[PDB]
DNA sequence: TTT
């Protein structure tokens, strides 16, 4: 199966730099054209930048809002695409996908379109400094019980900048569990996480929210308790 | 450069129903018109490329028509994954030009929320700060209120609220309210409830604790 | 990415 897997998105000053990376496996990487893709927070989708394949020689097109600031170029030898972003504006603000273009255009069309897609990296250009979560458990207090289930939490408050992931006991629970999307409040971020389980297996067994903030260097655990 | 128009930027249907969702250019694209799902969780995949070639693998409800600069996505028999994001795309020239998305979402039976309370921790009290959380699960339609009483009285400074997307096996949505206070604020009250009104009830749903019982 |  096609894989492309972007990294290098993390936090930069307007005006500064960063460079992209998306590695490619699952199909003959050097045959293909390929692109950069982005979406800027709660909006659509705007087509980046285009790199041909050696075949022709390594041709590159730009959308007019990122000409003479990004550079797109690949490595084919390491089957990985690049994008360096300089002189960055707020506005370059987005998640960005790395994206196959369609093949033999004799089979499927002369028109551009884009036929496989990564999962995205997420590129925020602000001001603001990089400030870790607090992270604070969600237990039910000493009170009433509903027999059937009880719902644990994790709150997680005041992070710069997006986005943290938490995930509930090494990611065996996936059913039950609610992930609230974060909420910017005077210049930084709160999400929270939910999950529901049989009140047989707890607190008798374990729970535990792991929340990553990749961009603050920051893993942190809790236990939960009663 | 060529402007991509989905005059309809939301819509929500039902299992079974026909959905067309239709995309203007605004010049002839000589039918290099693609379109594009983007699943809740944000993966796009492509649908329909070349106006109306079904890329393989993509389930045949998927169907596309049009030429000149009038184009139509169409799903037959609405099925419960379809819920996301449908994009159209332009490839004739450059720069590559998408629609701004129309956001599907799927209908099902009204459900009432499940809801939680929660005291604020003993880590954020020692740190001086007091944030108390409910938790809305499981409900439909999306419009909820919820309201915090503090010692009977409604309290709305502090208070921030996030829905979920909805949910892509049963279709319902979850929300989360947090009331952020000083530590100082938090001590000097005693009962705290979140109550949440829905249409699915004529009374709302209630859950409460007591400070000096935590 | 036909010639």
């Known amino acids: 199966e096609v894989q492309l897997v972007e990294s290098g998105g993390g936090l930069v000053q307007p005006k500064g730099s960063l460079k992209l990376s998306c590695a490619a496996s699952?199909?003959?990487?050097?045959?293909?054209?390929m692109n950069w893709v982005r979406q800027a927070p709660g909006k659509g989708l705007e087509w980046v930048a285009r790199?041909?394949?050696?075949?022709?020689?390594?041709?590159?097109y730009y959308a007019d809002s990122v000409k003479d600031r990004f550079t797109i170029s690949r490595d084919d030898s390491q089957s990985m695409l690049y994008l360096q972003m300089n002189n960055l504006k707020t506005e370059d603000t987005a998640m960005y996908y790395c994206?196959?273009?369609?093949?033999?255009?004799?089979?499927?069309?002369?028109?551009?379109?884009?036929?496989?897609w990564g999962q995205g990296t997420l590129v925020t250009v602000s001001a603001a400094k990089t400030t870790p979560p607090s992270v604070y458990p969600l237990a039910p207090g000493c009170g009433d019980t509903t027999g059937s289930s009880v719902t644990s939490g994790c709150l997680v408050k005041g992070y710069f900048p997006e986005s943290v992931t938490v995930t509930w006991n090494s990611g065996s629970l996936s059913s039950s569990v609610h992930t609230f999307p974060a909420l910017l409040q005077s210049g930084l971020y709160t999400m929270s996480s939910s999950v529901t389980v049989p009140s047989s297996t707890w607190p008798s067994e374990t729970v535990t929210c792991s929340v990553a903030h990749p961009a603050s260097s920051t893993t942190v655990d809790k236990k939960l308790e009663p | 450069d060529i402007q991509m128009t989905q005059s309809t930027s939301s819509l929500s249907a039902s299992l079974g129903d026909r959905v067309t969702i239709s995309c203007r250019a605004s010049?002839?694209?000589?039918?290099?018109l693609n379109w594009y799902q983007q699943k809740p969780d944000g993966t796009v995949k492509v649908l329909i490329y070349?106006?109306?070639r079904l890329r393989s693998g993509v389930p045949s409800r998927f169907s596309g028509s049009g030429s000149g600069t009038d184009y139509s996505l169409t799903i037959s028999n609405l099925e419960q994954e379809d819920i996301a994001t449908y994009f159209c795309?332009?490839?004739?020239?450059?720069?590559?030009?998408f629609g701004g998305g129309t956001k599907l979402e799927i209908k099902r039976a009204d459900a009432a929320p499940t809801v939680s309370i929660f005291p604020p921790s003993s880590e954020q009290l020692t740190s001086g700060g007091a944030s108390v959380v409910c938790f809305l699960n499981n409900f439909y339609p999306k419009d909820i209120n919820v309201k915090w009483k503090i010692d009977g009285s409604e309290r709305q400074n502090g208070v921030l609220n996030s829905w979920t997307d909805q949910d892509s096996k049963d279709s319902t949505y979850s929300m989360s309210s947090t009331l952020t206070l000083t530590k100082d604020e938090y001590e000097r009250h005693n009962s705290y409830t979140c109550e949440a009104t829905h249409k699915t009830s004529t009374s709302p749903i209630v859950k409460s604790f007591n400070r000096n019982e935590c």
């Open positions: 070349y106006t109306s």
């Open positions: 994206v196959r273009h369609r093949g033999a255009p004799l089979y499927y069309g002369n028109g551009a379109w884009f036929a496989y």
């Open positions: 699952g199909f003959t990487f050097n045959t293909y054209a």
């Open positions: 010049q002839d694209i000589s039918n290099y």
């Open positions: 795309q332009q490839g004739n020239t450059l720069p590559w030009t």
């Open positions: 790199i041909r394949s050696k075949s022709n020689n390594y041709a590159t």
